[PDB]
Design a protein around this ligand. Structure first.
Ligand SMILES: Ic1ccc(Nc2ncnc3[nH]ncc23)cc1
Ligand code: NI
Length: 316
């Protein structure tokens, strides 16, 4: 019965946050391979789940409009102050992206050109667990197919929140749920393939070897290099996936994920080749070197600059 809200339909239930498009463009962020939990259900209206609640997000030129669906058959109302703070933290709007863009552009002419069109590409502050297992599913995959895997994984293992039109929303499952004896077999049935093993195995590892999700919070306050190494002990988690989690979940802005995409960008757009390393093609050593290159160039928010180029590279 209940359906997706729009700003025209039910404007009484919405609430705004002052946000220029220099700071945030929804359409360049919510589907740029950071989160896989957002979909443009109706034009310019992005629906998705955040911390066991569903949101719908739209924006004008200088406002970010948002509405919440609590789901527990309570009185529908506007977002509260605390829910708005949660969304503020999610987009990290405390950090000025306008000043970052100008800073990166001063030492990078290529970024300057791309920054013209692609403004408001910022990093989401994601839940560690959600980020971890999502990016375990990302190996040899694509954003469309990953989005399917994660959706199905949440329906099978996660708690139901609400239904809107013909879309049922589920919260992300806890580690215990993914660590069960039947979890791998079920995940293979859902089409994850070899990734099903890593999902189950990393669930068990975090519980048994690292002591639950408190560990991921410890890595959030630990240094980048400490957190990175710790993640790489998990099944299915290497340097690429570890860096993604660092950048997107563990508040390491200097983390620069190096996969085939950024290796292409580095070579084509910056003319970079591995100098310190001997081998011409990709390698663990050469990928690490390229990460160091971008940190040296861009500085302590190098991962944020990387996301601007990554997002721009998706759009042909
Ligand atoms: I397949 C697949 C899916 C998603 C990604 N996401 C990213 N990887 C590296 N840097 C990034 N910055 N923003 C997203 C992002 C990569 C490969
Ligand atoms: Ni070359």
């Amino acid at each position: 019965h209940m359906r997706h809200r729009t700003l025209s339909s039910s404007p009484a239930l919405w609430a705004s946050i002052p946000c220029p498009r220099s700071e945030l463009r929804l359409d360049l962020v919510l589907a740029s391979g950071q989160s896989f939990r957002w979909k443009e259900q109706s034009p310019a209206h992005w629906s998705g789940v955040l911390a066991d609640q569903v949101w719908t997000l739209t924006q004008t030129e200088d406002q970010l409009y948002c509405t919440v669906y609590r789901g527990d058959d309570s009185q529908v109302s506007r977002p509260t102050l605390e829910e708005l703070e949660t969304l503020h933290k999610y987009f990290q709007l405390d950090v000025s992206l306008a000043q970052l863009y100008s800073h990166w552009a001063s030492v990078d002419s290529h970024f300057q050109r791309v920054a013209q069109k692609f403004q408001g590409v910022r990093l989401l502050r994601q839940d560690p667990t959600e980020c971890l297992f999502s990016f375990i599913c990302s190996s040899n995959n694509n954003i469309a197919r990953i989005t399917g895997m994660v959706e199905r994984l949440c329906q099978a293992f996660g708690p139901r929140l609400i239904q809107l039109d013909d879309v049922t929303y589920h919260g992300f499952p806890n580690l215990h749920a993914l660590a069960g004896p039947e979890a791998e077999t079920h995940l293979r049935k859902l089409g994850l393939g070899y990734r099903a093993r890593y999902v189950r195995a990393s669930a068990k590892a975090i519980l048994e070897e690292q002591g639950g999700p408190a560990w991921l919070q410890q890595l959030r306050v630990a240094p980048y290099e400490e957190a990175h190494k710790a993640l790489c002990t998990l099944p299915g988690v290497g340097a690429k996936v570890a860096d993604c989690i660092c950048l997107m979940a563990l508040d390491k802005p200097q983390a620069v994920p190096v996969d085939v995409h950024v290796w292409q960008i580095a070579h084509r757009d910056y003319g970079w080749h591995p100098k310190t390393s001997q081998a011409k093609g990709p390698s663990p050593l050469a990928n690490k070197e390229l990460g160091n290159f971008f940190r040296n160039l861009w500085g302590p928010y190098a991962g944020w600059a990387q996301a601007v180029l990554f997002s721009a590279d998706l759009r042909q």
